[PDB]
Design a protein around this motif. Structure first.
Motif, PDB file in Angstrom:
ATOM      1  N   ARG A  27       5.475  19.384 -39.856  1.00 55.93           N
ATOM      2  CA  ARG A  27       5.193  19.278 -38.445  1.00 55.93           C
ATOM      3  C   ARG A  27       5.691  17.972 -37.838  1.00 55.93           C
ATOM      4  O   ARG A  27       6.410  18.080 -36.845  1.00 55.93           O
ATOM      5  CB  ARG A  27       3.686  19.540 -38.174  1.00 55.93           C
ATOM      6  N   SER A  29       7.647  13.881 -38.056  1.00 53.04           N
ATOM      7  CA  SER A  29       8.668  13.200 -38.797  1.00 53.04           C
ATOM      8  C   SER A  29       8.376  11.747 -38.586  1.00 53.04           C
ATOM      9  O   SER A  29       7.822  11.357 -37.559  1.00 53.04           O
ATOM     10  CB  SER A  29      10.125  13.522 -38.351  1.00 53.04           C
ATOM     11  N   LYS A  59      11.132  17.908 -36.480  1.00 56.14           N
ATOM     12  CA  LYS A  59      10.511  18.807 -37.413  1.00 56.14           C
ATOM     13  C   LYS A  59      11.385  18.825 -38.627  1.00 56.14           C
ATOM     14  O   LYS A  59      12.456  19.429 -38.614  1.00 56.14           O
ATOM     15  CB  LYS A  59      10.464  20.273 -36.923  1.00 56.14           C
TER      16      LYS A  59
END
Lengths: 129, 104, 82, 142, 141
Positions: A27, A29, A59
């Motif tokens: 989900r 980074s 993502k």
RNA sequence: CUUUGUGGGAAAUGCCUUCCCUCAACUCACGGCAUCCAGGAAUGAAGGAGGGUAGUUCGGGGGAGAACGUACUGGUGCGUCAGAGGUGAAAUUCUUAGACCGCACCAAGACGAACUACAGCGAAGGCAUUCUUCAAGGAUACCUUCCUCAAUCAAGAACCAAAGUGUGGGGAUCGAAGAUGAUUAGAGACCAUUGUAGUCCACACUGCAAACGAUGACACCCAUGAAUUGGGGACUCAGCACGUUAUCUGACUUCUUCACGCGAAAGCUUUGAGGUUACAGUCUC
RNA sequence: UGUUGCUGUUAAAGGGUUCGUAGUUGAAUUGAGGGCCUCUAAGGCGCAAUGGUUUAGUCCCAUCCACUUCGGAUUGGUGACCC
């Protein structure tokens, strides 16, 4: 909310690995999450990974070759040192042979093996088998 | 202690109400929550078949002339109530989980 | 073979804009013509309020929250999202 | 559960300090009410003056009669019971003889078939009572 | 999660994935600016300025067709409000509840709601006096 | 005082030029020079929080005011005449001063059946006739707004079933205490006939429940099938309402073929007690 | 007594609920650079050349015509692709 970025990532990887799935989604980074993945991809535990850009937060997407068994997170980021490499390596890992703890240092992000080599301890980050 | 029934003998699901109005019994006057209480629908005849014949003879505008009405009621019973007139009975494990919904 | 990285067309028709890979917009614009003259005026698919021009008391859009219900007798041309 | 934060320390400390008071293996050490309660003052032994010989019964599953001794303590002026822990050595204890007194086994629970008694008589008049039992020494009346 | 009381919703507005202006918008920065300030003199908050703009003129975002967004415009021309939007709204709702409760002291709901709205306003206040945007002596009442 | 939509047409070596000749009451082209006068250089907009707008959206959500419904109980009138109440059987109890019963009408107080559900709303406790009225809350839709304002909690504050307490109003029904009759070896017993407090409302207290899902709060990942509840997507309260196919977000739960896994077992399963000796997401009791 | 390393559905143990201060904990961005030479160092979903009769193929074509589930035919064919 989530109070550790790493914890959010590597509970997707572990679960997916226990189901044998050959790709996983991640989900968020961070600059940090990248480096962690990079390590394991050199040593042969990950095929590839992509970072995709939504221009808010990326993502990550990863290809598992099924060669992992766990990827953990040591949450408080406790201080490990040149003698205390020994301590951690015994206590949280099933082996000294193929256990890899990953640490943070001023130098960068690296395995315990390379940490000892350059003779700098630091605060711990995560671990994998 | 042990969860004998998942729904707890209710048609009330967890985490919704936690309170449903009490309802009297047509036997003993006992109160229980509506969901717990044991509903049946009676459809009670106003004449036996044997007597239906005899009355329909003397009738001209009724019986043959129009079909006889019935007394309808809903009957909400208590647990103890039901069991004692044996309209609800104990069942083995596999069967207790079965429902027939609100259909007869 | 299926990929998470590059998804299939049919799958991403379905998805909500908050559940999407990109998380792009789910709206577009339109040219509504004012039938009370000829005045071409830009209007937004989810207008969520009336819009008027001085060429129309016929209005253009209704305020309704699901997406605009444009007045009957009005020319509709579909602008692209991009 | 627990708190894993870096500055979480003080909450942890205060949690332990609270929950050790739910342990009776903490109280038994730190609290001096326990010390006070113990009839020796928490010392290894004490001496006492024999008052009276008291015959004591036994509990239901094992019916027996047990020979016991009502003793007074020189140190604190408390009274206590104790058991004679040899066969036929009630004789070798007599009234107003000084005597030593010890605990026996588990010292928070009373011994089976003698209620209320955790106390056994080791020495009579500083002579080993065992020595009298299995003859080596003879009792002084001197 | 909803700040106070239950609620999970996902009702939200996204962004465009194109941050450069459309081909059907040939309007310059200056026209956009002018429109904003013009509308503002009616006493409209930025929230409704953006709505008027997007619907009528087809504007993708104010930020996309000008180098700055709606408040920055207003501030620079000295039309900006000194009470932030989010704060003001709550205070209005608050006072209106207090009217209703003045009449009806048997009303349970609106009482509890007022308690919420109060402490919420306080949170805002505290925020904007750390990040200066109100005087440091500001208080709800 | 034409043509007047815009590309199109003509003609060159995609582009230039000519020609049509750039519409929203000022719009397009050219010129005078007269003015006024720093200002567009900012990270982004978190399936993080706050706010806005809209569908006369959605609901046993909350307060107020006004009507409506039968029944229970009592009274009154019109008739009948001997038993009626009540139970296992009785008796207490009510009756020629006419009970019981039937019809009509009125009084007073409570309540809103069936429909009413492995449904809905509310932070929880809780919430059900209709009409009107006041202030809200959640969900959804949005290329609007704000830009880290957050999560959880000693201290502290508010709400809180029934029974209880204070004061005033009300008191139909049921009813602790009490009374009487049975049942019994003994029986205010359980049962029957009665009956006070209480049950209702207003304003104060109390905060004591199996207040339970015996499951703390927030966040991430996690599969099988069929439904339901709201929103969104493909003349006359009316460019409407319902249904079917398919999709999505938000709620409650079932597989009585719930996947992995966990657990001492019963059981738990995107709705965790799962992802935990390979022991560490965060906080608190 | 479980910081390393505890448990709380039913066994001792989640507070009736909500708000809320101390305290504890808190999302992403700033970015860690390159070229020329040697090395059979590897990969190649780049590629000029030129190789390969079925010493290896499939589309087209030829002959049949087989109502419909036969085929072979050679230089086939800068075709396709293979060492």
């Amino acid at each position: 909310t989530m109070m550790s970025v790493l914890a959010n990532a590597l509970r997707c990887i572990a679960s997916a690995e226990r189901r044998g799935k050959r790709q996983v989604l991640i989900r968020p980074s961070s600059k940090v999450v990248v480096k962690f993945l990079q390590v394991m991809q050199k040593h042969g535990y990950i095929g590839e990974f992509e970072i995709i850009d939504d221009h808010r937060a990326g993502k990550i997407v990863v290809n598992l070759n099924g060669r992992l068994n766990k990827c953990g997170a040591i949450c408080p980021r406790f201080d490990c040192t040149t003698p205390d490499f020994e301590k951690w390596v015994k206590n949280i890992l099933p082996s000294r042979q193929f256990g890899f703890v990953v640490l943070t240092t001023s130098l960068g992000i690296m395995d315990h093996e390379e940490a000892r080599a350059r003779n700098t301890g630091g605060k711990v980050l995560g671990f994998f088998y | 202690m042990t969860t004998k029934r998942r729904n707890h003998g209710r048609a009330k699901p967890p985490c919704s109400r936690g309170r449903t109005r009490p309802v009297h019994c047509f036997n003993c006057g006992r109160l229980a929550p509506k969901d717990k209480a044991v509903g049946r629908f009676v459809v009670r005849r106003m004449l036996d078949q044997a007597s239906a014949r005899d009355v329909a003879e003397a009738s001209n505008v009724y019986g043959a002339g129009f079909p006889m009405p019935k007394l309808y009621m809903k009957q909400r019973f208590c647990i103890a109530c039901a069991i004692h007139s044996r309209t609800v009975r104990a069942r083995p494990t596999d069967m207790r989980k079965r429902r027939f919904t609100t259909k007869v | 073979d299926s990929d998470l990285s590059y998804p299939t067309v049919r799958s991403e028709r379905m998805k909500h804009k908050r559940r999407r890979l990109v998380q792009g917009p789910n709206s577009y614009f339109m040219d509504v013509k004012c039938p009370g003259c000829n005045a071409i005026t830009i209007v937004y698919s989810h207008a969520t309020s009336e819009v008027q021009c001085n060429g129309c008391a016929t209005k253009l859009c209704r305020p309704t929250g699901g997406k605009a219900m444009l007045t009957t007798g009005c020319g509709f041309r579909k602008k692209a999202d991009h | 559960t627990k708190a894993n934060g870096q500055h979480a320390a003080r909450k942890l400390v205060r949690l332990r300090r609270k929950n050790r008071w739910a342990d009776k293996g903490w109280k038994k050490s730190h609290t001096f009410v326990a010390q006070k309660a113990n009839p020796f003052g928490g010392s290894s032994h004490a001496k006492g003056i024999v008052l009276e010989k008291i015959g004591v019964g036994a509990k239901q599953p094992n019916s027996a009669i047990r020979k016991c001794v009502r003793v007074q303590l020189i140190k604190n002026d408390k009274k206590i019971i104790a058991f004679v822990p040899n066969d036929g050595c009630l004789h070798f204890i007599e009234e107003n003889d000084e005597v030593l007194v010890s605990g026996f086994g588990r010292s928070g629970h009373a011994v089976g078939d003698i209620p209320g008694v955790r106390f056994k008589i080791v020495k009579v008049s500083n002579v080993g009572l065992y020595a009298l039992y299995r003859q080596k020494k003879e009792k002084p009346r001197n | 999660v909803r700040m106070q009381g239950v609620g999970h919703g996902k009702s939200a507005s996204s962004l465009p994935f194109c941050r450069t202006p459309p081909s059907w918008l040939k309007i310059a920065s200056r026209d956009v600016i002018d429109a904003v300030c013009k509308l503002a003199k009616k006493g409209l908050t930025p929230s409704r300025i953006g709505m008027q703009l997007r619907d009528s003129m087809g504007i993708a975002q104010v930020k996309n067709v000008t180098g700055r967004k709606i408040l920055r415009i207003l501030k620079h021309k000295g039309m900006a409000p000194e009470i932030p939007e989010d704060l003001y709204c709550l205070i209005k709702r608050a006072t209106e509840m207090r009217k209703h409760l003045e009449r009806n002291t048997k009303d349970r709901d609106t009482k509890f709601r007022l308690i919420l709205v109060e402490s919420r306003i306080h949170r805002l206040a505290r925020y904007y006096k750390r990040v200066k945007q109100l005087p440091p002596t500001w208080k709800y009442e």
